Design a protein around this ligand. Structure first.
Ligand SMILES: OC[C@H]1O[C@@H](O[C@H]2[C@H](O)[C@@H](O)[C@H](O)O[C@@H]2CO)[C@H](O)[C@@H](O)[C@@H]1O
Ligand SMILES: [Ca+2]
Ligand SMILES: [Ca+2]
Ligand SMILES: [Ca+2]
Ligand SMILES: [Ca+2]
Length: 234
């Protein structure tokens, strides 16, 4: 029932530990969130179960950096550890390879193969169970976090050129890859839901597969479309 449409791409399967890489050009405008994250589906349910999530989020008002986070604890009582990391060129101006490594001992964030953060113990010990790999584009109702939402900047697009998923066994062995020449429905799902604090409804209408890229779009409701050209990843 919301007034804007965003999108979420998620792996149908979940994994226990691993390395996850995505080649992407992020979207950014005041008020938006453009992401790559690991998520234990159901964490949002306040029935006593744990929350398990690892994030990379480009906040719209600051396209030249991204926020890293680990969310543990439980719904209604989360433990977080937000940190920020510069990206150059800006996340919405060039493709970068974002990586997440997760093992029993640490979580590591990389940009173009270089470490920007590595957390050990504490929260990491509570990232039990499995997590699926996800990407979404939306807008937060918290202006303090992402800036006031500038609707005139819509539509916005996040482009994913390819994804690599490695098994935890380096400590990783490549498991599968997707270059996105097509939408593989046996591997991915398209989110159709929302949550409090999100100004948009995540909809499968805003997931597109064009010219070797998976595109996530953030549009005004009723204007869900992509007719432009995909950017080059030279
Ligand atoms: O709100 C129901 C919806 O939640 C989805 O997980 C959300 C979660 O609600 C939100 O708090 C967190 O920040 O992001 C995750 C992923 O978008 C869940 O995946 C859906 O199945 C569910 O319908
Ligand atoms: Ca506004
Ligand atoms: Ca395999
Ligand atoms: Ca769906
Ligand atoms: Ca591709």
């Amino acid at each position: 029932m919301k007034d804007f449409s965003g999108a979420e791409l998620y792996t149908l399967e979940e994994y226990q530990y691993g390395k996850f890489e995505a080649r992407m050009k992020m979207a950014a405008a005041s008020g938006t969130v453009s992401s790559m994250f690991l998520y234990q589906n159901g964490s949002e349910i306040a029935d006593g179960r744990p929350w398990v999530e690892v994030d990379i989020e480009v906040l719209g008002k600051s396209p030249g950096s991204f926020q890293s986070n680990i969310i543990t604890g439980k719904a209604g009582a989360q433990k977080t550890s937000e940190k920020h990391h510069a990206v150059s060129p800006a996340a919405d101006q060039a493709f970068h390879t974002y990586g997440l490594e997760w093992t029993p001992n640490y979580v590591r964030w990389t940009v173009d193969g270089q470490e920007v953060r590595k957390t050990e113990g504490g929260q990491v010990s509570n990232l039990t169970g499995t997590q699926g790999l996800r990407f979404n584009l939306w807008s937060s109702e918290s202006a303090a976090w992402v800036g006031q939402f500038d609707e005139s900047k819509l539509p916005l697009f996040q482009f994913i050129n390819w994804v690599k998923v490695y098994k935890y066994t380096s400590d990783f062995t490549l498991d599968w890859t997707d270059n996105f020449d097509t939408f593989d429905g046996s591997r991915w799902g398209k989110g159709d839901y929302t949550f409090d604090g999100n100004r948009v409804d995540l909809t499968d209408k805003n997931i597109y597969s064009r010219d070797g890229m998976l595109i996530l779009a953030l549009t005004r409701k009723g204007q869900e479309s992509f007719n432009g050209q995909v950017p080059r990843d030279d």
